[PDB]
């Protein structure tokens with residue numbers, strides 16, 4: 767459904783997203799989506815907003831991530847929706 771070439775595209779996170787990304791990776795002016803997805807994913811795991819015990823759902827209503835995505839929770843398996851939420855927070859280069 768989602769082509770792998772999409773992970774090579776270049777983007778610039780908006781201020782709030784950049785704040786989240788910097789807690790897990792070095793600050794950069796331009797990121798590849800592969801980088802954005804990893805840092806976002808790593809932020810979710812280190813903060814345990816995703817417990818492998820709780821059937822694929824990430825709970826973020828008590829986190830900045832919830833403010834970024836505009837939702838209290840979401841499934842890690844519904845990738846199309848994740849991309850749409852992430853793009854609301856970045857600008858394509």
Ligand SMILES: CC[C@@H](CS(=O)(=O)C(C)(C)C)N1C(=O)[C@@](C)(CC(=O)O)C[C@H](c2cccc(Cl)c2)[C@H]1c1ccc(Cl)cc1
Nearest residue numbers: 803804806807808810811816824842843844845846848849
């Ligand atoms: C928070 C969970 C992270 C950890 S992880 O792999 O990124 C890693 C362990 C490498 C940090 N994560 C996953 O667990 C995965 C394996 C969940 C799944 O599809 O079964 C993949 C997921 C992912 C990867 C690429 C693109 C999308 Cl939209 C989602 C990806 C993910 C990345 C960002 C967001 Cl916002 C949501 C889910």
